[PDB]
């Protein structure tokens with residue numbers, strides 16, 4: 001006997017450029033927690049249902065997890081775009097969802113069954129603008145790009161634009177693109193002609209990486225910030241040496257000294273031969289929330305005896321009250337499922353000259 005927890009992430013499509021990191025973190029969590037006896041001796045079982053890259057696929061994954069796989073709760077989906085459409089399905093069904101990477105404004109407000117461990121754009125994004133200004137205090141002109149078809153990108157760009165204004169900078173253009181675009185020559189040239197000192201990009205990974213490369217090809221020599229959708233080493237293949245110097249805010253640090261982060265980090269580095277990425281740490285934290293909540297519930301009300309609909313509702317109620325020492329730091333939730341998290345960082349892509357290898361360097 002095991003306790004089924006659903007994992008609904010983008011395992012296919014270009015959205016898997018983010019999702020694959022999340023799968024890695026979730027698998028590390030499953031082993032970590034099961035090696036500690038699961039839920040008071042009862043192992044968990046992660047049941048993966050691929051969402052692919054769109055809303056329909058996410059709805060299907062959620063419905064399969066809820067109805068066929070009988071899961072006690074869901075971790076997912078990868079994108080805020082998907083969450084706004086699919087999470088209401090789980091809300092209506094009274095099945096908890098813990099978002100591992102959904103940072104758009106309004107996610108926890110979807111309902112009483114929706115929480116997230118991923119700190120939102122309003123608290124993560126501004127630090128990268130501040131970091132750019134530290135590296136070049138003479139930045140004056142800023143060009144902004146965003147993916148107009150993606151809910152998170154639209155939410156993030158609003159924060160970046162407000163931050164630019166509040167820092168007393170000139171917003172010289174806001175250019176739109178689609179996450180499915182590969183060619184940005186007209187928007188990039190439009191922006192370059194305005195002589196920006198800083199360019200900010202809110203998109204996902206393939207698109208964001210292609211845009212970074214093209215800006216550099218077209219002769220842009222100023223600073224670049226990428227938003228959360230570019231926050232993966234999977235961009236390195238796309239922009240190669242031309243990824244160098246991109247600043248990306250972080251809601252996780254490998255060097256955070258919390259005991260469980262040390263364990264998570266060691267497990268990650270031993271397997272993948274590099275530092276754990278944010279999305280992996282966040283996925284681990286989401287699984288952790290479920291395991292620790294299940295343990296607390298089971299101690300008070302043995303879960304093997306609770307029928308599934310009540311188990312789901314009691315698990316949701318429990319998880320919202322918990323305090324968790326996770327790889328992200330000490331976190332908890334507000335009464336509507338927003339994450340409470342203190343520490344944020346900025347990292348910078350450092351590519352080797354040949355362009356075949358790179359890393360994220362954390363700024364002090």
Ligand SMILES: [Mg+2]
Pocket residue numbers: 107108109110111112113114115336337338
């Ligand atoms: Mg909520």
